[PDB]
């Protein structure tokens, strides 16, 4: 089964789940849950949240 990344908290998205969003320039983003899309449209950064994969990578925790 083919999956794709989450672009905010890079999980795997199985078919029938997602939510895409096109910026003013033609860059496509792909979030799976409502929470992630809401956080991304409030201009928050994944590097500033303790539970995300980006934070654990910048703190040598993975």
């Amino acid at each position: 089964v083919k999956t794709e990344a989450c672009s905010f908290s890079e999980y795997r998205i199985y078919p029938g789940r997602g939510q895409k969003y096109i910026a003013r320039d033609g860059k496509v983003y792909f979030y799976l849950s409502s929470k992630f899309a809401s956080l991304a449209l409030q201009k928050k950064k994944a590097a500033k949240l303790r539970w995300t994969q980006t934070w654990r990578r910048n703190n040598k925790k993975t």
Partner: protein, 380 residues
């Protein structure tokens, strides 16, 4: 004078006495037309509703915008444990309608069949069906000879097995299943071989077939005209409140007519819906009952954490395209079409590419429980 502008009527008058139904179980009003060139066969089955999920399928419609693409569809799961055949009943035609000759029962019946005849079994001596099954076979054969000679319609009495489901109820459900097919003698020889056995569901239906569904809708109680009938909501300035109908009728038929929508009870209605297609018939003896040729993860049909408000499905089942009236646990009656469909949709055969089994509590993210432990590593 005439109304200023035209609009179609709100309600439908063909479902008119919107009252609560007599019973939970959905009853068949008419059976399919009997063709006597076919071999004898059963025409109906009964199961319980579990939940929904979605699948992935490849389209095969030349001319469509979706001719060669992968799509997603919703589906409904019905738990379909086998029934048991327990009796025979024969009808003959009269100018007053169909008429029963007699009923013949099998030699032994189960305690969950007998519970349906009691309002409280726990305090009783349980003497139902304890004398009549002790008759000599000669009387039964004479009765069957009479049924062969004078009757024109046979039906078979069958019942469900609620102990194999997660239901709290223990009484079985009883229904009559008509038997279409050849001559009356062949019908009788057909039924008797089944009189104390199991009907599995794949004996009755086939993959890719088209089916009709009978059940009772979900209940909601007393509702207003705005919700019950969908009438135009009234302006904010109105003095006694705005959720009503402004005019009940002209002066002078000096009564209210039966076509005017009022408040009343909504839901718990009896319905019959046509043309629901079968996608897969599962089997309880099969380890990969929700895996495809393109996805070889070994899976069952039940999502991570159980079907919400139902339980775990661990018998054999049906997968239907679309939706079905009723709540979780509601009994669903299944019937073949009145006459067989020959359109392109009813003949096309379906190949599935993905069945989803992620949790329906919250927003599920894994297909199995092993993936979840593999992703996080060791916890505290």
């Amino acid at each position: 004078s005439h109304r200023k502008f035209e609009r179609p009527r709100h309600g439908s008058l063909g479902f008119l006495p919107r009252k609560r139904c007599k019973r939970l179980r959905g009853k068949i009003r008419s059976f399919p037309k009997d063709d006597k060139e076919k071999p004898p066969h059963f025409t109906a089955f009964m199961g319980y509703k579990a939940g929904m999920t979605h699948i992935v399928r490849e389209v095969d419609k030349p001319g469509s915008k979706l001719h060669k693409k992968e799509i997603v569809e919703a589906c409904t799961i019905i738990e379909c444990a086998p029934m048991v055949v327990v009796g025979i009943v024969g009808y003959r035609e009269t100018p007053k309608g169909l008429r029963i000759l007699s009923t013949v029962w099998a030699n032994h019946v189960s305690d969950e069949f007998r519970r349906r005849y009691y309002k409280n079994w726990y305090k009783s001596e349980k003497k139902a069906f304890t004398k009549s099954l002790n008759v000599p076979e000669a009387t039964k054969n004479c009765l069957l000879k009479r049924i062969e000679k004078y009757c024109t319609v046979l039906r078979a009495i069958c019942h469900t097995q609620p102990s194999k489901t997660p239901l709290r109820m223990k009484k079985a459900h009883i229904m009559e299943v008509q038997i279409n097919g050849g001559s009356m003698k062949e019908k009788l020889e057909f039924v008797k071989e089944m009189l104390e056995k199991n009907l599995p569901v794949s004996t009755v239906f086939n993959p890719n077939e088209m089916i009709d569904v009978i059940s009772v809708t979900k209940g909601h109680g007393t509702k207003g005209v705005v919700s019950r009938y969908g009438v135009k909501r009234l302006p904010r300035k109105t003095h006694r409140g705005l959720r009503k109908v402004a005019c009940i009728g002209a002066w002078h038929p000096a009564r209210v007519q039966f076509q005017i929508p009022r408040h009343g009870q909504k839901g718990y209605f009896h319905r019959t819906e046509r043309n629901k297609k079968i996608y897969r018939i599962g089997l309880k003896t099969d380890k990969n009952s929700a895996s495809t040729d393109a996805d070889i993860t070994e899976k069952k049909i039940t999502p991570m954490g159980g079907f919400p408000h139902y339980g775990v499905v661990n018998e054999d089942f049906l997968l239907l395209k679309g939706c079905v009236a009723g709540t979780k646990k509601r009994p669903i009656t299944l019937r073949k079409n009145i006459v067989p469909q020959v359109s392109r949709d009813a003949l096309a055969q379906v190949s599935l590419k993905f069945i989803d089994t992620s949790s329906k509590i919250g927003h599920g993210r894994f297909q199995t429980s092993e993936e979840k432990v593999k992703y996080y590593g060791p916890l505290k």
